[PDB]
């Protein structure tokens, strides 16, 4: 069993400090920054990079829609070249930081809104591996397990980490519901269901079959590094090899 | 002899056409493409770049400050880190669009307020270049000929491209006067001395020594696209080689 | 017969500029302000105030989407408090700017995505209305002929200008075609129809049957101005009282 | 003995929360909405100014450069019809949300490096007083007490209060030095010795004569809503009426 575990991070902004990114960046293996569209800034960027570098986490674009009042959580109608060359500029802009801390771009993570959007529509999905191809066509989609979108990303020739979330609901499909656990106990539980089983239970009850290359988690507060450094915990126990997307995708 | 001819390009921005980038391209050697942050926008960038690819015109950064409302000709107070991965920033967005479109970054030449704050403050000067330091070493630096920022370049180990502006009138200490040549004769007369002579006279008739390595034309519209192809005509019957700063820097 | 000319002015922004403002304002009744979110800026917005006194031309608010990259021309997502009190801080804005000159606000007509998202989603409409009462009962929606939005304006207990578009193709219900006629004559027999006759044919040849209390022009291009001058010539031949809305609403 | 307590309210941010504003707002006479440009939007005017009608606390507006990145602290260089408008849209923008809430705006006290700024540059401060008259001559404008700023107010024509900071060290010249007393006790003495003696001693021991309208005091965290309660708690004690500008300017 192998899996990497990916954290939203940089996601402050300005004056705003948001997030406890230097503990939590102590458990996870990839961070998905901010590229100052919905979220981060140039300081923002270079600490979180920094950050990540010290800690030997892998770093990734986390690119959003325009939309800084709305922490891109907004969605917003872009055509398909808009869409493609919005993500092109947002991970060019992270990559220069990457490369001033030595380091190389491992993935692409769309945030909050992008992400949920190009679940539900194919043309912004293929739109977002164009943006994301013109730049390097060795980057890594992460996108929801088992979607279309994973299938369109191999069929244009991208390498894609099937995500999977610990703390969040199920539909039987596959997509989540727009409840979040809370407690670590169940959230550690329903980790090792993923990993161990390859699939969690709906809202319903119903099995939903899930390909768990990488676990979102968070750090939030000091409740949420809590959380996540269980996470960790729990799946040393399973013994399960936590490592980078790039080692095993 | 041998000079580059630069132009800002890609300045338009959203539904605001600005320029007739194509028209001028034809006749330049280098292009200093908008970031979006003064000026310009992911469409633009891309645009842009893929003329400039068209028209064999080598591509180069032109980050200003972030004040769009102002078109970046606004002091705007930072501090060394801030200014360093503020330009940081805005290399990396346009480096996803030449890398995009198969071509790689000559140069880097700051915009408005901030070429002129460079050349006013050393602190300002040295945070800039070495944000493009951070990015690549390999990249020139456009500044004002003869002036100190150059010489910083030079001792941060940067190569430099001295810039010298014949529609522009000059000061005896080779800083340019907050007139504007508006006859093609005439700006073509200041070309040739400039290229020829090495230098040109002050508004108070005093001589200035000037480095010439690039010159800043025009294509705002048809008459300074006008300007331009006779900027080329007249080096081009004086025997002055027209090539890219890339190749003589 | 009476009728209003209206027109979408102080789009220009920062250093771009765009339209014919002051030559267009010599025709029109009623001015629609950009409010500094999908076009114009705080120096657009007094500059275009002042004409519009200058030119006895009533000042009214044009808000839309946060989306400066866009024009306001792309569908955001908003929720209802969200988009109420968006256009109530447009709002608030421009009539600083109307009262800077001694003005009041006459009217409100939201600009482009936003109009059309108005018109398909009911609840949407509903929040604009509402942040337009919190402003001021007294002002004057604009929106389109025979729409739903202007039933739930009246319902709400806001005054409401149905506007129809001379230059625009319809369709059968009444909603305009995603067709641009570009002969001023051709407008002008259209301006006729509707003023006249209370209607017009849609693109399918059904009668559309239209309240006619305002006429959107344009004055983007010395043409426009010209059919936008030609427009007020032949209302005025055949007697209709060319007056602001506010004069009969 | 009579004086206001005002505080910067409405600072957060789209997903940004900052201060404690509801729980300050219990203490304060006078509330410093943000407009969007430094800091704050519009959900979060809207809130602000709702909670400031429940807690009985007077509106005013909080203008800023546009520089949300830089949370308005930094320096722009603007031209005196520049600030002018900028101040007047700002203005404007927050007088919707009092409007909404059936309250008056009272004052404007500028921001960050925009109020430093109009300290230093007479012209500036020129300018931003004319904003202010532009949209209401009895709105009252707070800046450095005994500072030029005061007069030239008074010499336009605009009621202006003194303001003071008991947490901060002064030069003698009644400017602040850019060291912040964090026990409340030490701050308490300073806020009595200012409305008691009208005065405080400079770092160097020199006294400092200080007209008292207002004392700026903070809710950025429990910490210093405890300071501005306690504040409070010792000026009722000395017998100092604490009510809002608008009762004694």
Redesign the interface.
Known sequence: MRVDLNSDLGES????K?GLDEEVMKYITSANVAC?WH?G???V??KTVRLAKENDVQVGAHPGY??????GR?????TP??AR??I??????????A??EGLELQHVKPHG?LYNAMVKEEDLARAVIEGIL???KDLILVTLSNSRVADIAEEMGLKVAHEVFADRAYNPDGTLVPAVIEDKEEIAERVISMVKDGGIRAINGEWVDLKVDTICVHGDNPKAVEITSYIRKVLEEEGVKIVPMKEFI
């Open positions: 902004f300005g004056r705003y948001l100052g979220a800034d140039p300081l960027m270079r325009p939309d800084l009042m709305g922490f907004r969605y917003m109608k872009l070249e808009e060359n919005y092109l500029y947002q991970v060019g802009a992270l990559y220069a930081f490369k001033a809104a013109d730049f390097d």
